[model samples]
Structure formats: structure tokens, C-alpha cells
Target: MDIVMTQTPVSLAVTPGQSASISCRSSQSLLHGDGRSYLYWYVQRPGQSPQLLMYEASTRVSGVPDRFTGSGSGTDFTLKISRVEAEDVGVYYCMQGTHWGTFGPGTKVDIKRTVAAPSVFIFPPSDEQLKSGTASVVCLLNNFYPREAKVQWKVDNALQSGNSQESVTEQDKDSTYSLSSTLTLSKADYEKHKVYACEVTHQGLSSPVTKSFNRGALEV
Candidate 1:
């Protein structure tokens, strides 16, 4: 049998006392014999190898900080940092250890710098507008370098799943790249106080730039 594995990339920045979450996806369930799933979480600091954080889904390994924790089941799992600290400044990743597949997609997290700012754009449907089933908010970037960027959606400080498409085009001066991320929300969610944000980052910058939108009582 062919084993299927799915992974989703995550990126976020948290303030000193705030929390953040990252998720890993798999095509099949990752349950193990011990009533837990065969999943692991790791973090990689600047110029360092990836370090294991949690094993067997939620078991905290030795030497890990108390702020880091994991919880979830089957194909959906989350790694959460309770209280952000300066030492926690780095990229975080989630891995699966199920029998079907040995490897999975890895997520990255980085710290936001004090001086740098990234460009951000957001397009959201108005409150009075209602579509057939659900409404979608889109975030896009039209010109950039290195061709590597990530887009995410959050509702009321909770992370929401999104679809992203990226492409590169050669221009006379330099290569231009574009990316788009869309978040779909049910009509009920649109009426609530929802905050959507977009963030962009590149190698040359020290921090990710963020743009946010707040919509109240979306008519749709």
C-alpha cells in the first residue's frame, strides 16, 4: 500500500506574552499502539540543526521549555507556544512518524525584528456583501525577489486554513514573483468580529511586514 503524507507550512510572530500555533497535515491517520499518534515537533534556531521539541504527538522531551506543547489527533496536530520569550526566536517545524510515511512537510517560524517592515495588502468583501455559500479574503504580492513567501489567515487570533498560489515572471530588470492566499469563511463567521492579516518576508529584511483588517457585522 502506498503511504500518503500531507504537511502544511506555518509562519507567525508573537508578542512577549502572547501565544502562537503551527499545524501539520497528513493524508492518513497517524495513531500508534500507545493511544497516541506518531508525531513530533522540532525547532531550528539560526545557524543550528533542528531540535526535537515534542515526541509521540504531545509528550514533551527532556530539556525542552515549559512553554512549548503539542495537541491534536490523526492528521491535524498543533504546536503551541504559551508565552513567547527571546530564546524562542527561531523557526519551528512539525514532523510525522507514522508507519505509512517516514517524512512530512515542515513549517517555519521566525522572529519579527524591531526596525524592519514588510509590505502588506489585503482585499476583503464588505459586510453587506453575501455570496452563495462562503466568502473569501485574498492576500497577494506582485513583485519580489528570491521567490519565497508565505501567506496565512487568522480568525479571532485563531489560525484558519488557506490555499496559496505562487508564480514567477521574468521582467526586463529583474524576475518578479507573485503569491496569493485565500481564506474562506462561512456566512456566520463573517458577521462576527474577525481579524484577517497578511505578512510578507524576504532574506534581505530583518523582520516580516504585517497588514491586518478588521470586519464587524459582515452582512453576508
Candidate 2:
């Protein structure tokens, strides 16, 4: 099985000159033989290629700024910056050297910025679908950052299973992302339920965003 790397604080909104710290936890020890912890850190600036920042959990790459520090050992690691700069606005990744490699869920860094909340638009079934026994409801979400959103479909309160499917996430020209989830249900069940909900879980939001479609108000 592949090793897993967990990172905290999916995004960081910091002012320039401020300090920042990112933590990464590994499922297994990264300390290999020969007295080295094979944990590394990389940074990918906006529209720029990824560059190596640190290696062996504590050693900085040549030419890397001293403001950036990599610390910790074994299963716990940290990447700390003494002073956040506009040039540092981007995503940071922690990589573990095992099983061909594993990287933590990257942490986005922004300078004096607001988190972009995603908006969900639920489309009602068409008249043709109303005539048919089966219908599909689509939930379109857009204007989010970090390029991922978890979507859950619910009838009244229970979660849906294989009846729902998600579209591939696409990036907008402006750098935001858009995606859709289609929930298939019988017209009878759709009518029977008092409400159908498309719940979106995004890193930008403090809580899950819920958009509901009432049974009697099926207009687009």
C-alpha cells in the first residue's frame, strides 16, 4: 500500500511580511537508513514551475532563501517561512520518499486575500424529463479556488449513492474552477420528497453550502 501524507490548513491567507507555518504528517516514518529523513518540500508559485525548497526534512536546497525553514523528523514535519512575500503566493507541497513517492494535499498561500466561496446553481428537470419516469437534476458549481469541491446529493436528509454522478472539474479562464453533479431519480420519488439538496463542501467555506430544490417549485 502507498504511504499517505496529511497536511493542515488547506489554504493560508496572510499579509506580506508575516510569518507562516505549514505542517505535514506522514502515515509512516520517513527516516531511512544513512541518517536521513527523506521528506522534502516544494513550492509552485502562481503560473510558475515547482521548485525544490528543502530536503531531508531540514536541509534547504542550494540558492533557496534562508527565510524558508524545514523542520521536524520521523512522521511529523513542518515548512516555515519567516517572512511571507508576494512572490510566495502559490501552493506548497510536502513529499514523502516511499513507494515511488507520495505528496501531501498542497496548501495554497495567498497574500492579503479573501477566500473565494463557491456558488451552486441547481437546475430543475426539464418538461420532457417530467413526462418520463426517470429524471436527472444537475448541480453546477463555480467560482472556487484550489480546484476541487466535494459534492453530495441528498433526498430530504439521506445521502444518495450510485444514483448520482459528478462531471470532470474544469478550470475557467480566470483560474477558478467549475463542475457539475447529476442526481438521477424517478419522477415519483422526486415528487414524493419535500426537498432535494445539493450540498457542497469546499475549503474556502467555513461550513458546507446547501442549496435546496423544493418538491413543488421545480422551476429552473
Candidate 3:
């Protein structure tokens, strides 16, 4: 089984010149028999490759700024920024140097900005896709900010099954976010006249945003 690496504060909103810290935990101890901990910290600025910040826990990589510090050992580790710069607004990740390596989910760092709500839309599966005995409908959310969005599905006004729900989110080039929730069902279900509603909850809004679709509405 793959090692699990968990991180705290999925996203961070900070002001320049202020300090920031991130915590990471590994499923198993990273300490080796040689008396060294094989852990690494990396920072991937926007539009750039991940740059190594520290290795073996507390050792800073050469040329890395002093403001970037790494500490802790074994399963728990910390990455601290003494003074955050505009360029530091990106993603920070912790990696283990064990066999085949494992990386944390990464924490997003960005300066504070006004909240933006995502635009939601649903796309019905193509006729070709339905020929395979299954149909997929996509509920897409675009241009949201500050991370964290929840999506729920309802079929005929009842909550959808858990296993049928799948989604993925991404950070866009403009610093906004895009996410998609997909509902897959059998062709028999798609042929039935039933309404499927997608409910999106974001911190930017006081109420949830919702969009619904049914076979009768997909003439386009």
C-alpha cells in the first residue's frame, strides 16, 4: 500500500511580510537506522516547478532563503516562513524519501482577496457515451476563489447515493478555482424522466448555489 502523507490547513490566506507555518504528518516514522530522517520540503510557486526548500528535516537547501525554515523529525514536520513575500504565495508540499516516496496533498498560499463565487453548469453525456450502457452528467463550477467547495447531488429530490458521486478541483491560471462533480448512472436511469440537481456550497456565499437537469431539458 502507498504511504499516506497528510497536511494541515488545505489553504492559507496571508498578508505579505507576515509569517506562515504549515504542518505535515506521515503514516510511518521517517527516521532511518543511519540516524537521519529522510524528509523534504518543497515550494512550487505559480507557473514554476517545485523548488526544494529543505532536506532531511531541518537542513535548508543551498540558495534557499533563510526565511524558509524546516523543522521536526520522524512522522511530524513543520515548514515556517519568517517573512512571507508575494512570490511565496503558492503551494507548499512535504515529501518522504522512503521507497517510492509519498507527498502530502499540498497547501495553497495566497494573499487575501475578495471572495468570488463559481459559475455552475451541467453537461449531459453525448449520445455515443450512452451507447455503452452508462451515462455521465457533469456539474461544473468555474472561477471560485480561496479554496474549499462542497457539492451534493439529488435525484428526484432525494440525496444521491454516495458511491455514484465523484469530483475533482483545480486552480486556474487567474488564481480562481474550477471543480467538477460527475454523476454516472445506467442507461436505463438516464432514459427515465427524473430530475437531478447539483447543490454547491461555497464560503463566499450566504446560500448554496444549485442547478438541475433532466432528460427532457437537454434538447441542445
Candidate 4:
């Protein structure tokens, strides 16, 4: 079985120069015989993927910014950001690299001056899976807050048969939140350039955030 890790505070809002710490908890004791938990810190920025920030309990990844620090041990770990900056608005994730590697849900760090909306992404199934005549379309949304958001799907603007959705929201040290959802579809519909859209709705958003397989949905 895989070990599970979780980051608390789901979301955060801080001013530049403020010092903050986000926590990650593990289901089982992470301490290994080597005297370390093997926990890590990684941040996912807008328009980019998760980047490793700290590893091995409390060591910074090479080339990591000076403001970030890692501390704690065993099942409980913390990622500390001193003098936080506007550039630090992103999702912070924690993980354990040992015992079958697993990651925490993630903690979002939002700079107060910056009003953040959810960043959405669509992932298609791998080539090998496509040959099975079925595919899974995953919609990943993060960096938003309040733990209230929506994710909906459309096929060729209107087709359905096999669809499923599930999400979990976690709170952050600073009172913000983050979430993600997914959708599944047929391989045939995708290749035909069917319009597969995942629409997201949040209280602060002026309108729903939507994404399609071909590109993005037209605003209305």
C-alpha cells in the first residue's frame, strides 16, 4: 500500500515580506532508519508544472529562491516562506519520496495584492490507451479559493454516456483553498475533434472558467 501525505491550510493569502509556514501530514510515520522522513516540498505555479523546492525533510532544491525554507520531520513537515513575494502565488505540495512515493493534495499560496482565479488544464489519455477505443480526459484546476468551484463536461458541445467527477478541497494556513476535477470520454469523439469542455464556476469569477479539447470554449 502507498503512504498518504496531506498539506493543511488548503489556501493562503499573505502580504509581501510576511513569513508563513504550510504544513504537510502523513498517514504513517515517515521516519526511516536513515534518520529522515524523505518528505519534500514542491510548488506549482500558474501556467507551469510542479517544481521541486525542498527535499529530504529540510534541504532546498538547488537553484531554489532564498526566501523558501523547509523544516520539521517524520509525519509532520513544513514549508516556510519568509518575506513572501508576489512571485510566490502558487500551489504548494508536499510528499514522501519513499514507500511507493505519494504527494499531499496541495496548499495554495496567494499574495494578497494579487486576485487569483483558477488555472485550468486538460489532459488526454496516453497513446497506448487510445487504441482501446476509450480515453480519459482529466481537468486539473488549482490556485483558486473558498473551496467552492464547479467542473462540467460537454462532448461535441453535447454528448454523454460515460462521465464521472470527484474532487476534494483542503484549507490553507492563510484561509484560501484549492481543488481539482476530472472527466472521461471516448477515443472516437476526441479524434473527430469533438468539443470536450470542462467548465469551472467560482463565486469571485466574473464568469465560468471553461476549457475544451480543441482549445478553449467561446465566452458567452
Between the candidate structures 2 and 3, which one is better when assessed by lDDT? Answer: 2
Models 1 onward score TM values of 0.47, 0.50, 0.50, 0.50
Error of 3 at 181 (Å): 49
Against the reference, the lDDT scores of all candidates come to 0.66, 0.84, 0.83, 0.77
Clashing pairs in 4: 9-171, 9-172, 9-173, 10-170, 10-171, 10-172, 11-172, 11-176
Model 2, CA-based lDDT: 0.84
Candidates, ranked, lDDT:
2, 3, 4, 1
What is the Å distance of residue 216 in model 3 from its true position?
A: 79
Q: What is the lDDT of residue 38 in candidate 1?
A: 82
User: What 10-residue stretch in candidate 2 is worst by lDDT?
Assistant: 168-177
The Cα error of candidate 3 at residue 120, in Å, is 43
Question: Residue 215's C-alpha lDDT in candidate 1?
Answer: 78
* Candidate 2 lDDT, 39-101, residue by residue in tens: 889998878898999999999999988999989988999999999876788889999876677
Candidate 2: where are CA atoms >4 Å away? 113-220
Q: Is candidate 2 or candidate 4 better by lDDT?
A: 2
